Amino acid sequence: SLKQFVNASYTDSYYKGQTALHIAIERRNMTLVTLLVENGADVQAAANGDFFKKTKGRPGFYFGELPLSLAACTNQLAIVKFLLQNSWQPADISARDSVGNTVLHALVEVADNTVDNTKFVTSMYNEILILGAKLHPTLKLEEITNRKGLTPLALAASSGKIGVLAYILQREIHEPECRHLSRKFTEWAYGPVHSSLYDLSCIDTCEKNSVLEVIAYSSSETPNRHDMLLVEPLNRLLQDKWDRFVKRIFYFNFFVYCLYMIIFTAAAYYRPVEGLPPYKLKNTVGDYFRVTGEILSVSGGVYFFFRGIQYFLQRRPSLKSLFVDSYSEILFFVQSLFMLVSVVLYFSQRKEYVASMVFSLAMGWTNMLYYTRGFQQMGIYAVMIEKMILRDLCRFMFVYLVFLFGFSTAVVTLIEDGKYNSLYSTCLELFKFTIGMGDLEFTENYDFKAVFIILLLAYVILTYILLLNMLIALMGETVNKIAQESKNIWKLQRAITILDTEKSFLKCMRKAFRSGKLLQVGFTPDGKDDYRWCFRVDEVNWTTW
Amino acid sequence: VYLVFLFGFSTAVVTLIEDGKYNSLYSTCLELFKFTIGMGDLEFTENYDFKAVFIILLLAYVILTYILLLNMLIALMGET
Amino acid sequence: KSLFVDSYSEILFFVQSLFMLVSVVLYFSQRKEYVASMVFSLAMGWTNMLYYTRGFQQMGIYAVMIEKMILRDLCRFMF
Amino acid sequence: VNKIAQESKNIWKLQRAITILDTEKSFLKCMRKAFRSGKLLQVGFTPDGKDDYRWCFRVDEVNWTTW
Amino acid sequence: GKIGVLAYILQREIHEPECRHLSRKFTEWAYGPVHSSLYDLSCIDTCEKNSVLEVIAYSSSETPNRHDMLLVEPLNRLLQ
Ligand SMILES: C=C(C)[C@]12C[C@@H](C)[C@@]34O[C@](Cc5ccccc5)(O[C@@H]1[C@@H]3C=C(COC(=O)Cc1ccc(O)c(OC)c1)C[C@]1(O)C(=O)C(C)=C[C@@H]41)O2
Ligand SMILES: C=C(C)[C@]12C[C@@H](C)[C@@]34O[C@](Cc5ccccc5)(O[C@@H]1[C@@H]3C=C(COC(=O)Cc1ccc(O)c(OC)c1)C[C@]1(O)C(=O)C(C)=C[C@@H]41)O2
């Protein structure tokens, strides 16, 4: 017999499932592939060994485990065609690997956004779609989800393969019986002006993996998550949503937060000065206003506390994403914690509630900067502040604190039985040099005046003259390199705001779902018409008349 | 941005201070602004409880405005 | 010349050790000036903590830039 | 600072190299695991009939052109 | 500090019979786009006296490219 011989395959766990057809495809040998398929080789054989998985800690090459995906992933179009439409055994274009990935999922996987890789991966994606429609008009490959529930578009969005996404979202196919696979259509074109229509299926809303939701709620490890929202339909859609729906709601929330902080400010400012809270309410107008302000302040704290919980549960950040991103959410949550601890101490009859309350109050005002997103100038400014705090201020503060503590310990050792003679006071006196208030003769309680003055001059040169001016130089370097990155992060922050606004929505309004339900093709594989909620974009071009 | 930070920390500090000389938004705002021109006293009052909280607030203000924001302003004017 | 134009860190650690040893000698020679040496060791010791910022990508670059600033711009400016 | 970015990267790498060398020379435990990369047979055909084992270092690379 | 010649030598590969053994870079397997090179490491990691890493790292500061030579592929990957 031949059926057992031709289909023999490796049994070891490292190369498990690899057979002769895989080898022939790998070696780019068309004749051997043809011969093996002719002799009854199984075109569905899954090479699922450890070598054929992602497995970043070991060598390997994941391609989707199937001969069709192997041919596709290696830029062999002829073999793809042959495998799909040979006489003896056509391949199952919709087959799935152990991960649930199809050929198209694999093509997304191998993409890495380089020009030469991206060009052919996009081309192979296109050709596979054409052949799928011609072989199986009733099949919808792009709607098949892997074991993680991701469609190829969702996988491209989450993995950050900007090239493939940029191809898919404006894919247009100009021929009969493949028009319906298009996502970008041209409705009319009068002079140089022409009105394109983008599909917006699974961009605006879907079951789970809307493209906007996938990009915005990325795990911060996606490579190009800042750059992907520059892909044409997405940016124009976000701007439209902002202007039509969300600009007013965001401004309203900003106004409300302003009022809340004014109330909190007034309530804290006029606190009573007797000891031992809680304080008996007096039957007078001013005290009624005061207690009203206190109640509203605590209520707002509770609101932000529960909002922070809802954010944590919805995003489930994995204990690094909880901190390396979602800066603003953590800060708002910490404000709410300080408010709540203030309440608890207030009723537990401790004056230390004041210590918590002010930390809330100060923090509350600084979180006003959260609302500088949604302004092109100020949002960029606030983003740059955040990046400064995270990079340059942290590095500087480590080095500065090493120098400060070193010279502080030296000076306090040299000082003997004086007023300062302690790490705390000496640290304050040395820090005062940084703010331009160093006495430079703050004590005489020593021997060896020369040693003391040498130490202080060394400190002053190293921190005041060297380090601070170096910090200014470094921040100057930084802003020169984070202008455009700041623009992209601002756009991303506004996108997140838009998504959260649509999710909250507070009025059960369906006007959030924009762009109108238009007829694109009117000719699906069956006789029905397709309405696909297109988004209209008008363009003008002075070439290609 | 500076006025947001200034008013936030002024309101915090003036809340923490109790029945002292300053004890007002005007005097405290002036006293915190004095840090920007390199004249911050850093011990301008003792009329409080919780010295540690007061010092933490002032050092936070100083870092955020004097060290971070002014140097950032110089960087941005350089870019502009 | 190579003893000074490079091996910056090695010189600094050696000088810390010299200050410690002079501190010991003065301490047992019944001179109070040992304190003067000890603090110079102590201060210097803490600053030599920056030696270990190599082996961290973003911090080691920062420490190297400090060294280059000290050698070029701070020296010319101080003259 | 605008001119010593890349130079700083190279000097950082060199300083880490110095650290690595000094560490392997001190080593404090008489451990031979410091000598890495495994003794592989490269060619197996020297000018004589003997095989050559040359302690190679393995580096994997991917290229999407030149198929 | 002759970075050019060094960069040539360390990844020298000769594709013909009876000169394979002179190579220092070899290709073991290449499956798809993925391929596994082997660099010799004789006289680089360790040797009698003049290991390449020791020679570069302990340069006299007057070698022109002492910073740049460790960017050559096998050396940087080995150090990492
Ligand atoms: C990064 C963390 C979460 C942080 C949380 C609190 C404690 C915070 O202290 C810091 C540590 C610190 C302390 C003092 C100076 C700088 C940094 O910085 C921030 C954090 C530091 C900030 C920096 O200012 C901002 O971040 C405002 C802001 C900017 C951009 C935003 O997108 C934003 O979203 C809400 C908020 C302000 C403080 O909350 C503040 O006003 C007080 C009293 C302390 C600051 O910890
Ligand atoms: C360059 C020489 C060897 C030097 C040796 C001593 C005396 C030193 O004074 C200097 C002269 C000086 C004095 C005051 C301010 C700047 C410079 O600078 C360094 C040297 C200057 C330094 C500068 O800070 C550093 O070098 C820390 C450091 C950074 C990077 C490194 O790779 C490093 O390797 C250990 C150390 C700190 C001092 O040792 C210090 O803390 C005291 C008390 C004096 C500084 O002489």
Q: Residue E43 in contact with residue E50, Cβ under 8 Å?
A: yes
Atom of ligand 2 nearest to the CA of C47: 27
Which residues, 6+ apart, have CB-to-CB distance to E16 below 8 Å?
none
| Resolution in angstrom units | 3.3
User: Which residues of C line the annotated binding site for resiniferatoxin?
Assistant: 8-9, 47, 54
Query: Alpha-carbon distance A141 to A155, whole Å?
Result: 14
Torsions phi, psi of A67, nearest 5? -60, -40
From the centroid of its chain, how far is CA A421?
Answer: 51
Q: Are A214 and A224 in contact (CB under 8 A)?
A: no
Extended beta strands in chain B, E state = none
Q: Is A314 exposed, middle or buried (0-12, 13-18, 19+ CB in 10 A)?
A: exposed
Q: How far apart, in whole angstroms, are the C-alpha atoms of residue A353 and residue A341?
A: 7
Contacts of C68 in chain A (CB under 8 A): none
Closest Cβ–Cβ partner in A368, A472, A480 for B71? A472
3-state secondary structure of A194: strand
Phi, psi of E12 (to 5 degrees): -70, 135
CA quadruple D15, D16, D17, D20: dihedral positive or negative?
positive
The helix (H) or strand (E) run that includes residue A59 is none
Task: Give Dmax over CA atoms of chain E in angstroms.
Answer: 45
Give B15→chain A minimum CA distance, Å: 5
Inter-chain contact E34–A73, Cβ cutoff 8 Å?
no
Instruction: For the sheet with E34-39, list strands across it.
Output: D57-62, E34-39, E25-30
Residue C12 alpha carbon to ligand 2 centre in Å = 7
Q: Quick one: tokens of C7?
A: 């091996």
Given an 8 Å threshold on Cβ–Cβ distance, is C55 in contact with D19? yes
Nearest CA to ligand 2 atom 22: C47
- Test E31 with A74 for CB contact under 8 angstroms: no
- The finding on whether A458 has its CB within 6 A of some atom of ligand 2 is yes
Cα separation, A320 vs A220, whole angstroms: 10
Nearest residue to A332 via CA among A358, A352, A302, A354: A302
**Residue D62 and residue A105: Cα distance in Å, rounded?**
20
Instruction: Indicate the fold that domain A1-233 takes in CATH.
Output: 1.25.40
| Method used to solve the structure | cryo-EM
